[PDB]
Amino acid sequence: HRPVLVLSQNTKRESGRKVQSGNINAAKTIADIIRTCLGPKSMMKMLLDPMGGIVMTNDGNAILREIQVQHPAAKSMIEISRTQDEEVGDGTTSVIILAGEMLSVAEHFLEQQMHPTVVISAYRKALDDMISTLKKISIPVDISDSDMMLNIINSSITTKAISRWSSLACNIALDAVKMVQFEENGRKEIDIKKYARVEKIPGGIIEDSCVLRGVMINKDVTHPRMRRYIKNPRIVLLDSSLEYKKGESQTDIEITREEDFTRILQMEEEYIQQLCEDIIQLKPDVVITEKGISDLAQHYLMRANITAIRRVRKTDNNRIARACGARIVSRPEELREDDVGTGAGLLEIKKIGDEYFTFITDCKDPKACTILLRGASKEILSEVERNLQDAMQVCRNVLLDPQLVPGGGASEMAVAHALTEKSKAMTGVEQWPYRAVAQALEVIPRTLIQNCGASTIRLLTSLRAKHTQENCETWGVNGETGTLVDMKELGIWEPLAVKLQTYKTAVETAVLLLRIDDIVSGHKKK
Amino acid sequence: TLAFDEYGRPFLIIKDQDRKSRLMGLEALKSHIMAAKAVANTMRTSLGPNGLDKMMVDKDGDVTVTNDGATILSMMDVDHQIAKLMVELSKSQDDEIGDGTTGVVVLAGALLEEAEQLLDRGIHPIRIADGYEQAARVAIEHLDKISDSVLVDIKDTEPLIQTAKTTLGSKVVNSCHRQMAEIAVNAVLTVADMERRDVDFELIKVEGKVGGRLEDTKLIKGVIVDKDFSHPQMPKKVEDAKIAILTCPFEPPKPKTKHKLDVTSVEDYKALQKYEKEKFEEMIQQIKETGANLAICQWGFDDEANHLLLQNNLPAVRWVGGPEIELIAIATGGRIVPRFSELTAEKLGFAGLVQEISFGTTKDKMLVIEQCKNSRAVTIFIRGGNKMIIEEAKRSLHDALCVIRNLIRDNRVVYGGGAAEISCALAVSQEADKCPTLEQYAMRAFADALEVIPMALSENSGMNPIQTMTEVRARQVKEMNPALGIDCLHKGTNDMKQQHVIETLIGKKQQISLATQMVRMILKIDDIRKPGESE
Amino acid sequence: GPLSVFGDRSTGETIRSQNVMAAASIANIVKSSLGPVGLDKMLVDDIGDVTITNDGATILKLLEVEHPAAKVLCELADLQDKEVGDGTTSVVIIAAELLKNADELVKQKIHPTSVISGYRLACKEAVRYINENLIVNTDELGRDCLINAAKTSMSSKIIGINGDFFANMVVDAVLAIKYTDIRGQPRYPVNSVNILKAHGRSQMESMLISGYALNCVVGSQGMPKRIVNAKIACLDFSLQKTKMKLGVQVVITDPEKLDQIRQRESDITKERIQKILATGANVILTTGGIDDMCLKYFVEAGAMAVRRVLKRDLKRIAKASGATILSTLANLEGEETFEAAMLGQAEEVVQERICDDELILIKNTKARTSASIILRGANDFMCDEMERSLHDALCVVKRVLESKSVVPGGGAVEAALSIYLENYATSMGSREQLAIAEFARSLLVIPNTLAVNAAQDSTDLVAKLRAFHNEAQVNPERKNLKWIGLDLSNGKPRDNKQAGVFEPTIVKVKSLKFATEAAITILRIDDLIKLHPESKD
């Protein structure tokens, strides 16, 4: 069988209007997955995974991560959700919706004999005015006021399914972030990623949840003769083992005399004694390590009335050091008093459902914390854990950037009008696609009132009319009533950093996707 | 490219283009010449008095061994569009002249073989084809220069018998070298029309019966049919035949249209029985009233007729075929009578002894007529010891009859044995240099091709072609060109005038003309579009 | 009869036609991405990896070709990247057209050897003509030619911004890495510039770092993450417990010495790790690793110890900070040295949070003041294209600084050459005037392609361009129309010198020489034999 002379065997090409409109249609399709996960009246989405698990959430990023798409253009929108998850907290659903609209308005102009570079250029210019406008309508935050900070958090957990217990979640998030405000060298940091541990234990009710002034580990004591309750322990943290091991060499010890066998074994016992004498010179109460503890080592530790924990994970041991103030050492022979975790509080090993949990709490001034969650099952515990992650990120955000923007749709309307008033003096071909950006901005209050069952004509017509005046500029959507209320009374305020990034991502997303005129598929790499 | 365009799309021009083949260049021309070599290598092996025979096995398993190129080439399974034309060349020669079934293939092949060098020299393919015409005219014009005959077709038939011997000498019937030569001459001259020089092929019938020997082949001045006397006790000998040729069955006449006779009464039933009896008597007496004593009927007989034929001493045969009663009526000078009631003595045939011949243990009962009155038709009766020699004998006598007809059409002859071909090659060479404008190479190639015949004859005769050709060509120049040819046994000298090797002028004129035209129509091709597999 | 070669053999006009198609199938790929009015491509492999690009190099490297005539154009693109560094789009477009026109000459019975001869004469004269119509060196334009050259190279890339944000970062990054070698070689080794990616803020918040950015982490969470007035210790040996070599074995007949032998394995390590810190070093860089015992001594000492960094980056830091890399002990059978006086410096070494990840910066370095660029994009697709776009822009500015000569862009070079060669073809037009004229005509594919991609009338817009370039050659009244190009945004001619549209001289002279050689080679493959692989026997 003589083949046809070809190049690039088993490859495909698509080009032209089938791509220019194709890639936009792909973005329009994926955008609808989380359309109903924006406002305070959202519904829960039940997602099934191939492993046999169930995810119940209304978080836009968690939902999209579980969706596998085939279209190479839809994959780009998934990457957008990945970026937002790390840069901002609650800048999720509104970004995918707005980004889709930036492409929708592009399709209109692209089919009207306009070169893609004119559409792209017009959007790039509009960004400068949307960012400039947002900075002019912000309000400074006095982050030292407990009530202002709690209200900011309340506005970020309202959308999520734990808003029913806002009087608990708001206090959990605010204090948990404060406990991880670091300043040791010349740099201020808020670390809510390495030390902000959330520990969920099935059982009880959500109203039982609390924040621990310290840490907890799911470990028991090595030996029942050791104390399970120490009011004011001297805590020493080790990284080394208390065992004797053959070295990484070719050591060969000849047993030739009657006593040689037993003499070697005696020295092995003496090794353990040498370690035991060095780790008690500081008169510790508690020794926590990561590696094994020999039976002989326990003999001496019991005589010293020392409580020992055997095999603590590295991520837990570093967190213990921050809570109790101890130093972790890897050479027991160089232990010093400066290593002892003074200022630590109660050590108590408790039983929760016939399972042991060791609590190290009531510390003077810990730099790490654990949030203890209780609930009926993993269903509610998973919902709470994820929602607290967002609350601590939003608290952290305003603590580093103390500026709020009037939210609930008020921001998007004010910016859309600012764009319109400037567009009057463009006097060029870009005048029209410039104005198109202002129209795209209105999708946010539109979707907020659609998800509430309200008229899309009565509210948006009146709301747009109210933003013709220069007095208020804070008219938005009341997601509970279905009417229009001045945001100065609703109290819905959103971080400036989230609003600035929302516009930057939406415009730059379009810049990438509007430049693709040719899709090549079917090649392999070597 | 096909099935792939620069834009990645399929590119389809003609149906199933991926199953086609095209190659033009000089490769189409070399492929045509090369394929012709395979054909020429076959026929060259059966040229000359030592020509070897071919065994042809038919698709049904039947086998016949022949020498006649018409029977060799017609049974080929060659699937090549140009090689098939080489067979048509031998057909055209067979239809017009009937002799050179081997020669035209060998000559045409030589023209294609010698042309091979001309293409490699860079000579335009068409200029080669035209160059052969300029040289061919020279050979043809000189071919008509040397010719003479003393044949008058009256009594001095010596050179006519010699022509038949020359033709038959190449066949497998040399055991009858003289006998069949004389039969062929007598067969044609007794039916040929001297006024127009026409010979009607239907006036010579060729029959045969397996058994005996070739030496028993006879020429019968009359007709041979399958005799089957309707009455087994009827005398089998008529000394003086008065022959009634009838095309009506010996049964009561019936209408051709729908009849459906209505019979009602017993008088009607019985009356018909009588009337029908009378019809049987009348139809026989109507023959006797004419003096006839032998009836030959296309149709059969009723049982009632056979008894009446006996009692009236009226022999007859049954179911004699269309062409048989046609030939009998002509050979005997009679006419075919439609009905019984139209019989008259004036339409009776006249013939002498009528007998049937029994052959060994079989029941063939073949007719022989001894005497006739100014018959214009003859029958040849071929015998032989096996089926193959008889069928080949039919072709051997056919060729002998054809060359006699050709001399009647045109009585100009030439000397054979290669003398005509060598002389033509020398004549073309002499004029090939008058003038060497462009065609010098082509005209010389033609002259060389003409020698393929005495060279192949020399090889089949057991001689070296260089030792033979160089001597004859020198002798034809050193002295006034004699009719000097070649032979295997040399017969003393190679003087064709003394060996009596006689060939027809119009035969060779057609061999040169037809071979040249066939070469032209297959040189001037540079594209073959043959389909491949079905799917 | 036929050859007994077991493959497939094609001769004559079969291969002479196929090579034209195969070459066109490659030029058709990049023709659509020429100029600022071109559009990008998305390349998706069989397993789902998506690459965004518009450059001829990346596209042709990723896309597989099979015809031997197509590999020639792919190699041509690869050579342009090596020799020049940029411009890798016109070498495929022009080279393919040279074959297309040659095919027309061959089918007219113009002997292939006379086609090749004529092409070489036209190329040599084109090199002369462009070298006689140069604009200016880089001394009169100063920094203006560098900002303009940067923005010109960006006009077709994702960083094609209207402003000077990136143009300033590129020009200053190249000028900041000036290293003069012997005999007056003020080189700008842009290959030493570390370009970093992160999916974060918009493009206009990318950073230009004075110093070096090292893709590493502090590691053990007890070390300082900011050091001011740091001494930098570069070394390349393992800070690990001491190991024995396989050729030495410990054979004990007196167990009393066992404990001392075991102890030695840690005594050597703990002493050496402290004696390198008694030197005053603040930041320790190693390409090996630091084990559990060794980390204690760096933490308690208040030192920053960075482990498992790439050797290619440590060598760059050591040169920029003035440090010597320590690999072993010296001083001619000295006890222990550690070359205490050979530490480097930096004003600040700090770990920052870059899109929820960790990056350590070394500020200003105080010896050579190297540069590093940290790009911000919205997603991974942009970040990869931005890195490629920055690399190109850095290379163009380097070439302008090293080769102090600029030529006009906008197709002005090709238009001018297309006329000069026509006069050469007439003056020497004996038997090769057909090949020379066709070479000249092929040059117009560049202003033609640009007009088509801009959706302009190609036959009018480009014809007008040639009218201006002709007048200044046939009416020698100092018309000064020889530097006019196409304005693809208005469909009108522009003065490229006043418009700021400059390109290097070498991207034109070298492209003509390289395309000529490839165009000649492809014309001498009249026959093709392909052998069947030893697969089916």
JSON list of C-alpha atoms in Angstrom, two decimals, chain B residues 321-424:
[
{"chain": "B", "resi": 321, "resn": "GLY", "atom": "CA", "xyz": [-27.95, -29.47, -44.14]},
{"chain": "B", "resi": 322, "resn": "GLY", "atom": "CA", "xyz": [-28.38, -26.02, -45.61]},
{"chain": "B", "resi": 323, "resn": "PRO", "atom": "CA", "xyz": [-24.93, -25.52, -47.15]},
{"chain": "B", "resi": 324, "resn": "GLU", "atom": "CA", "xyz": [-24.87, -29.19, -48.24]},
{"chain": "B", "resi": 325, "resn": "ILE", "atom": "CA", "xyz": [-27.99, -28.99, -50.43]},
{"chain": "B", "resi": 326, "resn": "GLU", "atom": "CA", "xyz": [-26.79, -25.61, -51.71]},
{"chain": "B", "resi": 327, "resn": "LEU", "atom": "CA", "xyz": [-23.46, -27.07, -52.86]},
{"chain": "B", "resi": 328, "resn": "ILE", "atom": "CA", "xyz": [-25.01, -30.28, -54.22]},
{"chain": "B", "resi": 329, "resn": "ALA", "atom": "CA", "xyz": [-27.47, -28.34, -56.41]},
{"chain": "B", "resi": 330, "resn": "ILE", "atom": "CA", "xyz": [-24.66, -26.17, -57.83]},
{"chain": "B", "resi": 331, "resn": "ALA", "atom": "CA", "xyz": [-22.17, -29.01, -58.28]},
{"chain": "B", "resi": 332, "resn": "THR", "atom": "CA", "xyz": [-24.77, -31.11, -60.12]},
{"chain": "B", "resi": 333, "resn": "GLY", "atom": "CA", "xyz": [-26.16, -28.27, -62.24]},
{"chain": "B", "resi": 334, "resn": "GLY", "atom": "CA", "xyz": [-29.64, -28.50, -60.73]},
{"chain": "B", "resi": 335, "resn": "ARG", "atom": "CA", "xyz": [-32.01, -26.30, -58.76]},
{"chain": "B", "resi": 336, "resn": "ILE", "atom": "CA", "xyz": [-33.65, -26.51, -55.35]},
{"chain": "B", "resi": 337, "resn": "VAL", "atom": "CA", "xyz": [-37.36, -27.31, -55.70]},
{"chain": "B", "resi": 338, "resn": "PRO", "atom": "CA", "xyz": [-39.69, -25.89, -52.99]},
{"chain": "B", "resi": 339, "resn": "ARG", "atom": "CA", "xyz": [-42.53, -28.42, -53.15]},
{"chain": "B", "resi": 340, "resn": "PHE", "atom": "CA", "xyz": [-43.40, -31.86, -54.50]},
{"chain": "B", "resi": 341, "resn": "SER", "atom": "CA", "xyz": [-45.91, -30.50, -57.02]},
{"chain": "B", "resi": 342, "resn": "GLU", "atom": "CA", "xyz": [-43.28, -28.17, -58.52]},
{"chain": "B", "resi": 343, "resn": "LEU", "atom": "CA", "xyz": [-40.97, -31.07, -59.46]},
{"chain": "B", "resi": 344, "resn": "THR", "atom": "CA", "xyz": [-39.88, -31.18, -63.09]},
{"chain": "B", "resi": 345, "resn": "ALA", "atom": "CA", "xyz": [-37.16, -33.01, -65.01]},
{"chain": "B", "resi": 346, "resn": "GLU", "atom": "CA", "xyz": [-35.52, -29.71, -66.00]},
{"chain": "B", "resi": 347, "resn": "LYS", "atom": "CA", "xyz": [-34.39, -29.08, -62.39]},
{"chain": "B", "resi": 348, "resn": "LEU", "atom": "CA", "xyz": [-32.80, -32.50, -61.80]},
{"chain": "B", "resi": 349, "resn": "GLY", "atom": "CA", "xyz": [-29.09, -32.79, -61.14]},
{"chain": "B", "resi": 350, "resn": "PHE", "atom": "CA", "xyz": [-26.78, -34.95, -63.25]},
{"chain": "B", "resi": 351, "resn": "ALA", "atom": "CA", "xyz": [-23.98, -36.99, -61.70]},
{"chain": "B", "resi": 352, "resn": "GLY", "atom": "CA", "xyz": [-22.17, -40.28, -62.15]},
{"chain": "B", "resi": 353, "resn": "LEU", "atom": "CA", "xyz": [-21.34, -42.98, -59.63]},
{"chain": "B", "resi": 354, "resn": "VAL", "atom": "CA", "xyz": [-22.79, -42.29, -56.17]},
{"chain": "B", "resi": 355, "resn": "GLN", "atom": "CA", "xyz": [-21.28, -44.36, -53.36]},
{"chain": "B", "resi": 356, "resn": "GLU", "atom": "CA", "xyz": [-20.78, -44.25, -49.61]},
{"chain": "B", "resi": 357, "resn": "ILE", "atom": "CA", "xyz": [-17.46, -45.22, -48.01]},
{"chain": "B", "resi": 358, "resn": "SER", "atom": "CA", "xyz": [-17.14, -47.15, -44.76]},
{"chain": "B", "resi": 359, "resn": "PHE", "atom": "CA", "xyz": [-13.97, -46.47, -42.74]},
{"chain": "B", "resi": 360, "resn": "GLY", "atom": "CA", "xyz": [-12.61, -49.31, -40.64]},
{"chain": "B", "resi": 361, "resn": "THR", "atom": "CA", "xyz": [-14.87, -50.14, -37.71]},
{"chain": "B", "resi": 362, "resn": "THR", "atom": "CA", "xyz": [-16.84, -46.88, -37.78]},
{"chain": "B", "resi": 363, "resn": "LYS", "atom": "CA", "xyz": [-20.14, -45.83, -39.39]},
{"chain": "B", "resi": 364, "resn": "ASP", "atom": "CA", "xyz": [-19.20, -42.54, -41.02]},
{"chain": "B", "resi": 365, "resn": "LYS", "atom": "CA", "xyz": [-20.71, -43.39, -44.46]},
{"chain": "B", "resi": 366, "resn": "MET", "atom": "CA", "xyz": [-19.10, -40.55, -46.38]},
{"chain": "B", "resi": 367, "resn": "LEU", "atom": "CA", "xyz": [-20.19, -39.65, -49.91]},
{"chain": "B", "resi": 368, "resn": "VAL", "atom": "CA", "xyz": [-17.96, -39.88, -52.97]},
{"chain": "B", "resi": 369, "resn": "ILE", "atom": "CA", "xyz": [-19.02, -38.63, -56.40]},
{"chain": "B", "resi": 370, "resn": "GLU", "atom": "CA", "xyz": [-16.94, -40.10, -59.22]},
{"chain": "B", "resi": 371, "resn": "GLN", "atom": "CA", "xyz": [-18.07, -38.18, -62.31]},
{"chain": "B", "resi": 372, "resn": "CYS", "atom": "CA", "xyz": [-19.65, -34.76, -62.84]},
{"chain": "B", "resi": 373, "resn": "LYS", "atom": "CA", "xyz": [-20.56, -32.40, -65.69]},
{"chain": "B", "resi": 374, "resn": "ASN", "atom": "CA", "xyz": [-18.59, -29.10, -65.79]},
{"chain": "B", "resi": 375, "resn": "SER", "atom": "CA", "xyz": [-18.56, -28.78, -62.01]},
{"chain": "B", "resi": 376, "resn": "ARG", "atom": "CA", "xyz": [-17.23, -25.53, -60.54]},
{"chain": "B", "resi": 377, "resn": "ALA", "atom": "CA", "xyz": [-16.63, -26.93, -57.04]},
{"chain": "B", "resi": 378, "resn": "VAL", "atom": "CA", "xyz": [-14.14, -29.42, -55.61]},
{"chain": "B", "resi": 379, "resn": "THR", "atom": "CA", "xyz": [-13.65, -31.14, -52.26]},
{"chain": "B", "resi": 380, "resn": "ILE", "atom": "CA", "xyz": [-10.36, -32.04, -50.58]},
{"chain": "B", "resi": 381, "resn": "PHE", "atom": "CA", "xyz": [-10.38, -35.13, -48.34]},
{"chain": "B", "resi": 382, "resn": "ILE", "atom": "CA", "xyz": [-7.56, -35.07, -45.79]},
{"chain": "B", "resi": 383, "resn": "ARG", "atom": "CA", "xyz": [-6.38, -38.20, -43.98]},
{"chain": "B", "resi": 384, "resn": "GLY", "atom": "CA", "xyz": [-3.88, -38.59, -41.17]},
{"chain": "B", "resi": 385, "resn": "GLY", "atom": "CA", "xyz": [-2.73, -40.77, -38.32]},
{"chain": "B", "resi": 386, "resn": "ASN", "atom": "CA", "xyz": [-3.77, -38.40, -35.52]},
{"chain": "B", "resi": 387, "resn": "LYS", "atom": "CA", "xyz": [-5.93, -35.34, -34.97]},
{"chain": "B", "resi": 388, "resn": "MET", "atom": "CA", "xyz": [-3.00, -32.90, -34.86]},
{"chain": "B", "resi": 389, "resn": "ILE", "atom": "CA", "xyz": [-1.39, -33.68, -38.24]},
{"chain": "B", "resi": 390, "resn": "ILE", "atom": "CA", "xyz": [-4.82, -33.45, -39.92]},
{"chain": "B", "resi": 391, "resn": "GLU", "atom": "CA", "xyz": [-5.63, -30.02, -38.46]},
{"chain": "B", "resi": 392, "resn": "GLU", "atom": "CA", "xyz": [-2.13, -28.81, -39.36]},
{"chain": "B", "resi": 393, "resn": "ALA", "atom": "CA", "xyz": [-2.58, -30.31, -42.84]},
{"chain": "B", "resi": 394, "resn": "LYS", "atom": "CA", "xyz": [-5.72, -28.19, -43.20]},
{"chain": "B", "resi": 395, "resn": "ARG", "atom": "CA", "xyz": [-3.63, -25.06, -42.57]},
{"chain": "B", "resi": 396, "resn": "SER", "atom": "CA", "xyz": [-0.78, -26.35, -44.76]},
{"chain": "B", "resi": 397, "resn": "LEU", "atom": "CA", "xyz": [-3.08, -26.75, -47.77]},
{"chain": "B", "resi": 398, "resn": "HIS", "atom": "CA", "xyz": [-4.79, -23.46, -46.90]},
{"chain": "B", "resi": 399, "resn": "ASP", "atom": "CA", "xyz": [-1.50, -21.58, -47.32]},
{"chain": "B", "resi": 400, "resn": "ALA", "atom": "CA", "xyz": [-0.81, -23.44, -50.58]},
{"chain": "B", "resi": 401, "resn": "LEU", "atom": "CA", "xyz": [-4.26, -22.50, -51.89]},
{"chain": "B", "resi": 402, "resn": "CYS", "atom": "CA", "xyz": [-3.78, -18.86, -50.85]},
{"chain": "B", "resi": 403, "resn": "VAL", "atom": "CA", "xyz": [-0.48, -18.30, -52.66]},
{"chain": "B", "resi": 404, "resn": "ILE", "atom": "CA", "xyz": [-2.01, -19.82, -55.80]},
{"chain": "B", "resi": 405, "resn": "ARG", "atom": "CA", "xyz": [-4.89, -17.34, -55.52]},
{"chain": "B", "resi": 406, "resn": "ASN", "atom": "CA", "xyz": [-2.33, -14.55, -55.07]},
{"chain": "B", "resi": 407, "resn": "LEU", "atom": "CA", "xyz": [-0.55, -15.49, -58.31]},
{"chain": "B", "resi": 408, "resn": "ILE", "atom": "CA", "xyz": [-3.92, -15.43, -60.09]},
{"chain": "B", "resi": 409, "resn": "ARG", "atom": "CA", "xyz": [-4.58, -11.95, -58.67]},
{"chain": "B", "resi": 410, "resn": "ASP", "atom": "CA", "xyz": [-1.07, -10.81, -59.67]},
{"chain": "B", "resi": 411, "resn": "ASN", "atom": "CA", "xyz": [1.35, -13.02, -61.60]},
{"chain": "B", "resi": 412, "resn": "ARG", "atom": "CA", "xyz": [4.50, -11.02, -60.72]},
{"chain": "B", "resi": 413, "resn": "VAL", "atom": "CA", "xyz": [6.93, -12.92, -58.48]},
{"chain": "B", "resi": 414, "resn": "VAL", "atom": "CA", "xyz": [10.32, -12.36, -56.85]},
{"chain": "B", "resi": 415, "resn": "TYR", "atom": "CA", "xyz": [13.20, -14.59, -55.77]},
{"chain": "B", "resi": 416, "resn": "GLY", "atom": "CA", "xyz": [13.13, -15.73, -52.15]},
{"chain": "B", "resi": 417, "resn": "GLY", "atom": "CA", "xyz": [15.64, -17.26, -49.79]},
{"chain": "B", "resi": 418, "resn": "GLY", "atom": "CA", "xyz": [16.55, -13.83, -48.46]},
{"chain": "B", "resi": 419, "resn": "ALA", "atom": "CA", "xyz": [17.68, -12.59, -51.88]},
{"chain": "B", "resi": 420, "resn": "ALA", "atom": "CA", "xyz": [14.98, -9.91, -52.01]},
{"chain": "B", "resi": 421, "resn": "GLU", "atom": "CA", "xyz": [15.62, -8.76, -48.43]},
{"chain": "B", "resi": 422, "resn": "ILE", "atom": "CA", "xyz": [19.42, -8.52, -48.76]},
{"chain": "B", "resi": 423, "resn": "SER", "atom": "CA", "xyz": [19.10, -6.72, -52.11]},
{"chain": "B", "resi": 424, "resn": "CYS", "atom": "CA", "xyz": [16.69, -4.20, -50.57]}
]
